[PDB]
């Protein structure tokens, strides 16, 4: 049984996800507009910034 934590109402489903460095919620990297080639050391979601 999978989890939904990202703001697009869609579950993990094997998709890479990054943690909100502040609120802790897990955001799909695609939704966070993050390329696998450049990944922030600290990430902040829309709610927390
Ligand atoms: Zn997502």
Author numbering: 337 to 385
What do the authors say?
These results suggest that PHF23PHD selects for the higher methylation state of H3K4 (tri- and dimethylated) and discriminates against monomethylated (H3K4me1) or unmodified H3. Collectively, our data indicate an overall similar mode of action for these NUP98 fusions during AML development that depends on binding of their PHD fingers to H3K4me3, a mark enriched at promoters of actively transcribed genes.
Although PHF23PHD was crystallized in the presence of H3K4me3 peptide, unexpectedly we obtained the structure in which the N-terminal sequence of one PHF23PHD molecule was bound to the second PHF23PHD molecule. Much like H3K4me3, the SDLIT sequence is bound in an extended conformation and pairs with the β1 strand of PHF23PHD, which results in the formation of the three-stranded antiparallel β-sheet. The I340 side chain occupies the aromatic/hydrophobic cage of PHF23PHD consisting of F348, M353, and W362 with another hydrophobic residue, L339 being positioned to make an additional wall of the cage. Substitution of either M353 with valine or W362 with alanine abolished the interaction with H3K4me3, and replacement of F348 with alanine led to protein unfolding, suggesting a role of this residue in structural stability of PHF23PHD.
